[PDB]
Design a protein around this ligand. Sequence first.
Ligand SMILES: Nc1ncnc2c1ncn2[C@@H]1O[C@H](COP(=O)(O)O)[C@@H](O)[C@H]1O
Ligand SMILES: [Ca+2]
Ligand SMILES: [Ca+2]
Ligand SMILES: [Ca+2]
Ligand SMILES: [Ca+2]
Ligand SMILES: [Ca+2]
Ligand SMILES: [Ca+2]
Ligand SMILES: [Mg+2]
Length: 439
Amino acid sequence: ADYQGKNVVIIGLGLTGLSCVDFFLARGVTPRVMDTRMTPPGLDKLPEAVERHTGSLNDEWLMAADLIVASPGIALAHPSLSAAADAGIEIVGDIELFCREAQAPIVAITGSNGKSTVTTLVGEMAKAAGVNVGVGGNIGLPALMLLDDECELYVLELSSFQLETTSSLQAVAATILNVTEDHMDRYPFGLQQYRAAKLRIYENAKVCVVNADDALTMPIRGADERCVSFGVNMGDYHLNHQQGETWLRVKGEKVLNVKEMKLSGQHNYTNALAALALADAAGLPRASSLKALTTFTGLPHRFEVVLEHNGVRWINDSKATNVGSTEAALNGLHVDGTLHLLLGGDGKSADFSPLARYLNGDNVRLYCFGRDGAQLAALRPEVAEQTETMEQAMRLLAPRVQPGDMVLLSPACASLDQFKNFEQRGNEFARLAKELGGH
Ligand SMILES: Nc1ncnc2c1ncn2[C@@H]1O[C@H](COP(=O)(O)O)[C@@H](O)[C@H]1O
Ligand SMILES: [Ca+2]
Ligand SMILES: [Ca+2]
Ligand SMILES: [Ca+2]
Ligand SMILES: [Ca+2]
Ligand SMILES: [Ca+2]
Ligand SMILES: [Ca+2]
Ligand SMILES: [Mg+2]
């Protein structure tokens, strides 16, 4: 597209907004930028020529714009943007700018949880085929930074927020991995409004990869000729368990024994299925996609085995910052002995009731900590203990573990009551697991 001579206004000075600044500068357009933070991080990366307004939005800049480029962090329902839309001013996001310029096929991945794992895994499947793939869309690698005429395939993690401002995506393969009651501040009309944003990913997609176990991932008008499904018990891509073993199964045929993979956990196996379906639909060779399943290590803090010693598996799932993530970790969980489950942190007022149905059975102990520890213990008090910190909880459970047990940090809560971020929380869990269970 051609932006020469337009008044372009960018909202947001995080890395996404900065990538938009770069995009226009590279095209000879000097945009204006604004951010409601007084001292946003990206301020000192801006060139001198870019006019900027911080500490609030500048309404007169928005109402004078030919094009407003809105960070995913501001709602279309915000009154300033509603006023600009009411006036007929075009509002887009970074992904819309990307899709107008992308010259290679796009695999597009959204969903409440698992987006990063599946995006990274499709990327690895492409690399195993020798494809110069561009993988991004997460906050640390905005899509616009990937644009390159040398790129042969784009694999994008897309949020519901980005999809709201995107109209030009034509994915070769697209998925909604799952939809759980999260992100509700931005979606006041509830789960179906949140879903509606994600459903945009299937518009003009050639193949839709849907979750056979989550009906909210089906296209808005239902399954159609484009749809390929993944699931636990059935679907085009599903899991087969027998004789103590598990296989990935595709269209009625085992394709891989999961013992050849490095990932753990039923939900990572369905992530692997979703990735394979997307890779297949994108035209990547099956053989190299399976090879990537055997070499992919997984992402840190995503149901990550940080220690297996004396028959005890210590699992860092610190990225489980919400109930839906922890629910998926507990669903289908395979533990020969006792599950020692670490829950805690800042729960953000969530309903933890959904977790209750997994916490019966005589082989479960709860170790609850952080701001909301007491609420988590109340799920099943007779098997629960409460401490202030994660370290205290781990020191309680460590003398009790026996071969066959699992120690699972899947907190269902944010980490910011006690840690700098979830990475620090998972890194501290890994250190303590080695201190306490490594010998
Ligand atoms: N298919 C899934 N459904 C629900 N949660 C998941 C799924 N896959 C991964 N997760 C968890 O969701 C969080 C975010 O994963 P990711 O988006 O891959 O960083 C981590 O706690 C993951 O272990
Ligand atoms: Ca931004
Ligand atoms: Ca802002
Ligand atoms: Ca609270
Ligand atoms: Ca106690
Ligand atoms: Ca306490
Ligand atoms: Ca956190
Ligand atoms: Mg079902």
